[PDB]
Structure formats: C-alpha cells, structure tokens
Design a protein around this nucleic acid. Structure first.
Lengths: 122, 209, 54, 114, 119
RNA sequence: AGGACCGAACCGACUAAUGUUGAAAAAUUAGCGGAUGACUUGUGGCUGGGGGUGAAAGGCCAAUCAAACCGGGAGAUAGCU
RNA sequence: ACACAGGUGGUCAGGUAGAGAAUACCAAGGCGCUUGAGAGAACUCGGGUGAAGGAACUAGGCAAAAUGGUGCCGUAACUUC
RNA sequence: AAUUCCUUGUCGGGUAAGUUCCGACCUGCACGAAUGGCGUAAUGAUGGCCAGGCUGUCUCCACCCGAGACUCAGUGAAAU
RNA sequence: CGAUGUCGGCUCAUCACAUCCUGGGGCUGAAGUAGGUCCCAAGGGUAUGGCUGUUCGCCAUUUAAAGUGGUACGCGAGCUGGGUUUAGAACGUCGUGAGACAGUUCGGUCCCUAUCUGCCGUGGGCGCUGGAGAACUGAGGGGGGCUGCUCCUAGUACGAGAGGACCGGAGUGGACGCAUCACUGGUGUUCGGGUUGUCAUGCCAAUGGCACUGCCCGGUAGCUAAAUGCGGAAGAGAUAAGUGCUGAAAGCAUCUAAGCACGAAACUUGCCCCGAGAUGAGUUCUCCCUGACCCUUUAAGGGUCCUGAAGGAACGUUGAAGACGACGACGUUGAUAGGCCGGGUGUGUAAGCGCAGCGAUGCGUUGAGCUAACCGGUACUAAUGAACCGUGAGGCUUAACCU
C-alpha cells in the first residue's frame, strides 16, 4: 500500500535508516506496492559507515506495511510501521547481511530464499 | 441447457478444510414447474415457460389464473422463459429441481441491479473530481466540458453525463458452484450476484467455454 | 440563459397541456351520518367509517 | 432468513474458549509449507473482538523485536487450531486501540483476578 | 440514498427534532388529542409508544429514565399511575391515525393522533 | 519611560469562499494588522473649480473628477452614423 | 429608493469559571428574525470524520490541517548590547 | 545581481531529478558613489527558496449533518 | 470592430491514419536472440515527478507503448487566471521632458435563474381496428474488444562459444469496467460510554439543555472503497497485405483470365444490455361482454332505458424502486408499515441497595442497564364497506374450407 513519495523504514544492516519510495515498478500506471514486490528507493538518512550512503538510487522490496496482507482465510497481518529491505539494483540480491524484525510468509519465493532464512521470526 | 429461477437469500462464507474462506451467495431455487412449452409449429422457436413461488389466490387475475388452470400448475409469483438447445425436451406441468445443476461447473447469474436513482458523473462514469481548492468556484464534481466548438456544434449521442443508476438487468458470467442441495432447495456460488436480498435471479449454465 | 426568439401562444399552450389538475371523482360516504367525505379521512362533524371520534 | 442461520450452524465449530478484551491470549495456528503442516504459536493481548455468527473474529496485538505486530483471527476458520487465555486482564473498554501508541511500561494491562 | 434508512429529518436540526419530539410527546399524554400534520404524527408513534410500555413497569430506575425523556415530573407521574395499568394488556398499537384534511395557511396534510383507550 | 510587547472596545482592510438581475450601486463569513499615539471620535467652523486639499494615487472635493454640480451662449459644430 | 445581513455619538453594566468590557452558560429584560408543509436525487453552499501514503496537487502549502494557557528548567549564530 | 539580451552563462551546494534559490568567477548588451555606493541588528498582512510537524491539497475520493435545488399550497419578476 | 475572449493548465472528450505498442506478412548486408526496412491493419491501450506561467524542452525513474495530427492552434453561458497586456511602483536603457522600451521586477474584481437545437435520463397522451393481463420473437442500436512477467516444451532447434527460439500449453499480475458487503475497513450528528464549564429539575443523588455532534472513545444497519468475485475468451463466416494448387492466353512459365485452398486484435458473428412508435406498429397464451326500445333528410348515423364484465384507475399502508411521475409489495380470505415479544449487535458491569475506606473511590447484585435502520415472529394500531373509468360480440372486400 506503498506509493510514490513514501518514507519507509528499513529492516537490514545495509546502512540506510530512512528511505523514500520513488517508483512502483512492474506495471504502467501502477499505484501501490504490496508485500514482496520491487520498488525503487532513495536513501534519506544513513549511519556514517554503512554499505550505502545518502542519495543513492537502488531497488528494494516491502516486507512490512500498516495496511497488512490478507490471508486466504480472511485474516490480516498488519504492523505498526512500513519497512523495506534493500537490494542491489542489477542483481536483485539483498545488500545487507542480517534482518531486523519479523517478516511475513508471502515473500517465500525463489528470489527471496535468502531473506526468510535470514529472518528471525515468521 | 436451460436455466432456472432463484431468489437471493443473502450472502455468507464457507470454510473449506484446507483453509480457504470462500465467499458464497445462497440462492434459494424452488422447483420450477413448467407452465408452457413452445415449439416451431405455432411459435417458430423453441422455449419453455416456468413459474415458482406462491402468490395470493385473490391477487392473481382472471387471465393469469386461466393460464395456470390450463397448465394444471399451481400459481406462482412470476413467469420466465428459457430457450432450449438441440436435444432437449420438456412437458407442460412437469417440475424441474435444483439437481439439474448437480454436474455443471460454471454458471451465469442474471438479475436487476440495486437501484441508486439519479447519480452524478463522478459515480456514473468514474469522472475524476476537479480541484477542491486553488481558486475553483462552483465547479467541483461537475462534468466540465461536454463537447467541442462550432464544429461539430453539438453533443454526440451516447455522451456520458449523469442519469439513472441501477434497476436494470445485468448478467455476471462464469461463477463457480460450491454446493447443490435439493434437500434444502439451495444453491451455492462463489462471488457476488446483482440485486438485493430477496430479489429475483436467473441461473443458467455458462456459455463461456 | 436568455431566450432568443419570442414563443407563441401555441407553444405556451402545449407546455400548459400537462398543467391541468384532476378532480377527486369519488368521495366516500360515512355509514351512519351518510354525508360525503374524502376516503380514509374523517368527515366534517367528526365521523370516520361510522364512529364518532372527536 | 432462517435458511442462512441453519447453513452457518453446520460449519460452526462447537467449542471456543470464553475471552474478553484485555486477556493475554495464546493462539495456535496451522501453517503449511512444502508438504508438511505445523502448529505455530502466537502470544499477545487481544484488543478488539467482533462477534458476528460464523464471521466472528478477534484481533490480538503482539510486540515482537521491538515493534508491534497485529493479527485478526477468523475464530471459526479451520486454520486456527487452539485458543488459550494465559492471563485475565482488566480493561474498561471492549476495544483497546489505544495500545497502538503505548509501549513499554505504558502498555501495561492490569490483571482482572475475577 | 435512503436505502433501508429509517427516521425522517423533517427539514430541521437533529437537536431540534429531538426537542420537538420531547415536547410534543408530553402533549400527547397531557391532552390525549392533537390535531397536527401527518408526517409528525406517524413518528410520534415511534417515540410515545416505547415510552408507555416502558411505563408499564414501575421502578425508581424506570422513573428516572422516563424523566430523562420528556423532562417533566407531572408527565412522569401521569404516565406511570394511569396509563401503566390502563395499557397492561396492549401488545402495541397504543395510538391511531385519523386524517383530517389540510390546513388553510399552507395546505399541510394534518391528521389527529389518538390513544385508543380514550372514550 | 517607550511613535515598547500580547490582546478586547475602537480604527482599518492582507488572504480565501460566498455573493455577484446580491441581503448590500464594495458586503457577509473564517482568519488578519494597529490598538497611549504621526491614535481615534462627537460638535461647529475654514479652504472651491484651472481652484482647494493631498505622509503624493492625478487621489479626494455630496455613490460624479486628467478639471465638480446647476443654469445660460446652445438648436455649439459634426466632411460621421 | 425597500418593514434592507450595512452605517450612526454618549450613559448603566449582575452570578459561575475566567487576568479581563475576551470567551462559554446564565439573572433582570427582550426576541424566535412576515411564507410554510414534505421528500431525503444529481449538483451548489456551510461544516464533521477517515484506511494507507503525507505536498506527489498547484504558478504558488491557496485552502485546510496543526500550535495555543500558567509556573519552572533551558535556549544558538548575529548585534547598534 | 529589482539591472545580464545571448542565458537554463560556467562551477559548487541542496534534489533521484532544480529555467527558481544559495555561494563563487567576471565576457558589467546596459552597476557605481546623495535623481547616493556597499554592509547593516531589529522590524514587515513585503518578494524568492528550503526543512520539521501537519493534514482530502492530492493518488481518489467515501460517508454523514444542515441550507437550497425537487413536490404541494400563497404571492410572484428579468435580461431578451 | 452597434464585440466571434488570448496562451497555458484542469475536467470531458471525438475523429483521421502518414501506426507508438499489440496483430499479420514480404525483403534483409535476416545463424538464433535482437534489429533495419516496407506493406496490410484505427479494434483496444497509449506514464509519474524536478525546473519553468509555459506549449516545447532537459533531467530522474517507469512502461509493451509513453504516436503524429484535425476538431474557433477542441473545450472560460465548464473551471483557473500563472503569462501576455489596464490603471500603482522600481531597475537598466532612450528621450531635455511628459513618457517609452512581447526587456526585467512586486501587486492587481473572470457575470448569466437555459427559450430553441443537441445530449443524458424519466413520464403523460394517442396509435397499433372489440377491450384487457401476461410471456416472447427479432428488424435495429449500444457496451465490451488492452497487455506484461514466470514456468513446461528446452536449456531443445540454431550457434565454434557466448548466448538462445518459433509453434503450442500452463500459471500469475498492471490498468479498465461491472456487481456485491461474506471478509478488512471508512462513515455512521438516530446506539452506548468517558469528560470540562455552566444553567435547570427544591436539594444529595441521578439526569436534561448549551458550548462546532461542546470535546472525544468505540460502534448497528445502509452506502462505500482501500475490500471480494467476474470479464475482455474459445469458436464460426467473408477477407486485407501476403501464401499457394491446376492452367492457358503466349507449345515454356505464371495465384487468374475459368475454377479451387489458406490468410490479422480490422469486418460479419459469437458475449452482455436496450429493443414492436419495427406507423412494416409483430408472435403466442389466457380472460371478459351474446338485453331491448325508438329517431332520421338510411349513415362505419343518432338517441333512450337497463346493463358496468375482465381489467384499469383512485385511496391507504409502503419499499434495499424513486427528484416528481413511474416501478414493485400489501389492504382484516392481512405480516404492507409501525408498535410489541424473543434474539442478535454495539457500548461496557446501569440505577438503587449493602460493605470497606475520614475521602476521592473500589467491590457484591453484575457481562448488569440501555440499544437505531438487523433476524424470527406477533392483528395491537392504521391499511372501510363502497363508488369511478372501462361495454352489449366487434367494419368492408376477396380467397379456402365447413354445408
């Protein structure tokens, strides 16, 4: 439920702290980003000596959102904040080496086997 | 294959054992006693006519009761017609129950949509609202321009402006079935059907292959 | 918002075709007093369907 | 509409435990991956209960890794397996949405002991 | 769009609607007769009739609740002492509608209101 | 003490909406600035038309101002309609 | 020009909360505004709320939203101190 | 630069992206010393830019409360 | 020139094809993948931001694609007024000066109640040849026609390798539309609760009013999307460019001159909706009327009494139908609306009483009290008995049968 001009938390140790979603790739006139889909982000605040700095353009995926994700039985899993996980722009692999905070279950796919294994819970 | 006539009980949910919460519409389909069978000799086409429900014996008119007395069929709440395909045949006065749909997969549902009266261009054709501020005066949800200048100098037919919502027939296609139960005279479909609770509906097998 | 040519007495007449009212054409009678009153309304002196109510 | 009420009564699960808002409720939920299914715990405080026949649901707030995770639970779904109250809290409301802004010692639910 | 919506607004404020139905319902027990307009009479039925069946049982809690509405003590004692035992058998239908034509000032369709016990 | 500060009466008019054959020939509504001073206001007087007055816009001078209003020359003149 | 949402100088000024002639509810006192009754369409005007994002709208944060009181702690560049 | 036509001069900052802004260079079409020059604390219903909070401004509207519009009765215009 | 309002933006579009994508094909200096070019094709779709008033343009990032144009460089009796280009003021420059310079710079009132055509809906009257209630046929008209990515074929064909298919099949998305409230939610000033100030009910208590619903917290039904299902399909016919078979004219050859077969989101259908005013007014089924008498300048003539059918209209209760009409349900051979009973929901353990505590308060009754539009019922009230419109067998001519 993430769109353009959206501030986003970060769940890895790539170096970002607050990032800005500037695109929702994957479709013409696409409005929103769900969970586990490609978005292009820019970094607004970072730790001094992380793997990335301020003002870089690179892709990310959404792992938490306040809108939630609908289960097939009708349940919904929502969080207090919207958080993302950094990826390299060309290889689509995660920049960081750890995941902070739980992620959901619908990221389970061949592209994201690294993240859920690195996830601490769920 | 010919279709049936049902009444919308409402909506509920069905919990499959795997865990899918399928939203389901309950359609009460009382057995359709056939009131008229038509052929090519006098009508030039093949169709049958059914009735269902129960009407008051005082309120059914003399020509309406005369049609029911001829068929040997007790009075219902309405009359509907279905064309038959090649190979089908039916007799006047025979009943048709829910169990015709015991082997079909996809059905089409036809009904009259919920009437909403006079509704604006924002609702009738999803017209995007103009600026609510920045100097705008008396024109927020208006349709704006409706045509071009002196050439053509007129508004074309079929141009989208405001009008009447609802209260017209609308068919929803290719709905899956869930249950068939003539013991409860019921029928279960995944999804949503037009009309309100207690409205009239037509349920036919899907022509969409 | 302003008319361009003067309409006739005819065109005003066609517009006034639907303007006529209709009479009651049937006013009911109370069973006791026998006077004529509007249907489902009380009569002049306080009767309705044959009982005094006022 | 007695046809509807009889229809949902069949898939109505027979036994559910009684709980009210404020209760620290432990939920066991089936999860299926691959070819196996497992039972997954979920602890937390219930904050909103919607009682409506077959569509009844209740929402549990869980703190996790420093941040808050919220579920809703379709009570009569086959996905949820076991519900067990682990603490009887005392609240003055049927809805506890003010716990979205209270954390730590502020998010402290007094037990009910009734 | 009034789909399954009940309760008239009567071209007035919501508090004014409550205040009118608070005052004029007190007039129905006071004089047992009102000539008033037809739509106001139909929903006097919706407010007065729950009050009398509330007054069918007498208790200190019910008197205070019957004082929160109609805000008059003389109405409350009249409601409980007389129409309490008087209407202990009625299963609804505590009043009736008697149409009486129209006004002369504005042509407004009026109708009498009438508690059916009055003889 | 202060051509001080915040803010009512009071003086004014910066923004927006409505109005714009209006409730009103400039207003209402929500905000807004000054508010012991070069302040504001009641009563009376003084300054008059190529003249007055003007913390100066060519503004104001009886809903009229790059020369007021009323009457007169005057039936000005009009190669124009 | 109207039985007009405007303009018009002075005097009196109570209770509670409030610093107050602010403001809210009231006392004495005066009014309910010279068309009403329904229906509960679009659309317009005046407001209330809102998922998620939070200026991406637009010429422009226009409008709207937000801050608001008292006491105490503490408060930078610059400076005519 | 209230002045610069070529011009969105060139470089740096801010931005993911800046014809606006800020700092600098001087090739000043056509600055310049009381028709004042350069700074200048404070002040401004002043002009331009950026940031935090804030939100229906917007993605994209949705519902509700009131006044009209709509129906009935009474009176009853206008431009053209 | 007794007025045709300008650029730009917003809303709304409509058409052309010299086609941006998707579709089909020829040639290639076309290995494949990806392209170049050209032909056929208008069905459908055809970006978001930063800067500037901008159109345009550059930049960042998407997309299959971000097409070119006409429509008063579409669209101000639809919106804005940022620019140009009023009156104020200033800079540079020209002029002695008043002033001026599509040079710059700051500020700067955009009216209209729609008569006709047009369009969107919604009705009244009449007609369709006795009247009426239904159900349809279908002439005709409208809507819909978008598409990526992943997987299997296959890591095959092709290729030294890098790389990497067509054909076909499977799944899942982006946008658009329809429908719905089962789910998550929003609203929910008619439900419950908290609380401030004040006034009032004599007073404590408990309540009520006002302060934007006083300020808030939740929340029934309805509506609603952000929520949930569905769709755009398969197939058929004739085809465009193109691909051919047989075969002369013209002993060969040739898709063409005779004949025959393929060939695309276009066309005609298939899908959905409207549709007998289709004055060409249709088809089928059912229902109702079978009495007399006069008058005339005797006609498809006029009139009197009696009859008043089927059906319709009106009134009332009304509706998830609705601006009003219209549409649907019901009228005591009744659940149409309201009330009531039970339930459900929502809010949260009322008031009163008792105990503890100097007290604010807490506890027991007590998950109590109250509950709107919801569910199941329930004649308690209002839907009255009657009147009103509607007629007396339905023209002429011809043909076939029954006689």
């Amino acid at each position: 439920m993430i769109q353009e001009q959206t501030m986003l938390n970060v769940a890895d140790n790539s170096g970002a702290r607050r990032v800005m979603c500037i695109k929702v790739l994957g479709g013409s006139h696409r409005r929103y980003a769900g969970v586990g889909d490609i978005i292009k982000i820019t970094i607004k605040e970072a730790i001094p000596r992380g793997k990335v700095k301020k003002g870089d353009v690179l892709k990310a995926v959404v792992v938490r959102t306040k809108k939630g994700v609908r289960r097939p039985d009708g349940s919904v899993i929502r969080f207090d904040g919207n958080a993302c996980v950094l990826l390299n722009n060309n290889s689509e692999q995660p920049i960081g080496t750890r995941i902070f905070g739980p992620v959901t279950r619908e990221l389970r796919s061949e592209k994201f086997m690294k993240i859920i294994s690195l996830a601490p819970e769920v | 294959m010919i279709g049936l006539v049902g009444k919308k009980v409402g909506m509920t949910r069905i919990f499959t054992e795997d865990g899918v919460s399928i939203p389901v519409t309950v359609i009460e389909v009382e057995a359709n006693r056939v009131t008229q069978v038509k052929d090519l000799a006098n009508d030039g086409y093949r169709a049958i006519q059914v009735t269902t429900g129960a009407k008051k014996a005082n309120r059914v008119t003399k020509p309406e009761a005369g049609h029911f007395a001829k068929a040997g069929v007790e009075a219902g709440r309405g009359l509907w017609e279905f064309r038959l395909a090649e190979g089908e045949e039916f007799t006047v006065g025979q009943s048709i129950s829910v169990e015709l749909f015991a082997d079909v997969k996809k059905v089409d549902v036809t009904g009259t949509s919920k009437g909403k009266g006079f509704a604006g261009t924002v609702k009738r054709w999803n017209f995007r609202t103009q600026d609510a501020t920045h100097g705008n005066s008396l024109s927020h949800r208006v349709p704006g321009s409706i045509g071009q200048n002196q050439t053509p100098g007129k508004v074309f037919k079929g141009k989208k402006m405001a009008g009447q919502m609802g209260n017209e027939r609308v068919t929803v296609q290719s709905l899956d079935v869930v249950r068939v139960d003539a013991e409860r005279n019921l029928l279960l479909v995944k999804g949503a059907v037009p009309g309100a609770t207690g409205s009239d509906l037509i349920v036919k097998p899907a022509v969409k292959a | 918002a302003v008319q361009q040519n003067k309409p006739t007495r005819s065109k005003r007449g066609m517009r006034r075709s639907h303007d006529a009212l209709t009479a009651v054409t049937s006013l009911s009678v109370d069973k006791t007093s026998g006077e004529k009153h509007l249907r489902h309304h009380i009569t002049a002196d306080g009767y309705y369907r044959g009982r005094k109510v006022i | 509409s007695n046809i509807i009420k009889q229809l949902e009564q069949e898939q109505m699960k027979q036994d559910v435990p009684s709980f009210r808002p404020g209760d620290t409720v432990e939920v066991k939920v089936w999860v299926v991956e691959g070819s196996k299914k497992r039972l997954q715990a979920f602890e937390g405080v219930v904050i909103a209960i919607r009682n409506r026949g077959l569509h009844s649901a209740f929402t549990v707030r869980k703190i996790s890794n420093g941040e808050g995770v919220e579920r809703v639970f379709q009570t009569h779904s086959p996905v949820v397996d076991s519900i067990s109250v682990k603490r009887r809290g005392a609240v003055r409301k049927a809805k506890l949405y003010y716990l979205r802004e209270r954390t730590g010692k502020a998010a402290r639910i007094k037990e009910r002991l009734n | 769009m009034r789909h399954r919506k009940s309760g008239r607004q009567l071209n007035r404020n919501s508090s004014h609607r409550q205040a009118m139905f608070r005052n004029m319902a007190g007039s129905l027990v006071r004089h047992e007769i009102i000539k008033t307009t037809l739509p106001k009479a139909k929903e006097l039925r919706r407010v007065v009739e729950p009050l009398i069946t509330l007054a069918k049982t007498d208790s200190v809690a019910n008197r205070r609740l019957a004082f929160a509405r109609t805000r008059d003590n003389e109405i409350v004692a009249k409601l409980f002492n007389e129409l309490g035992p008087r209407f202990a058998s009625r299963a609804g239908g505590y009043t009736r509608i008697l149409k009486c034509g129209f006004r002369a000032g504005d042509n407004a369709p009026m109708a009498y209101i009438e508690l059916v016990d009055r003889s």
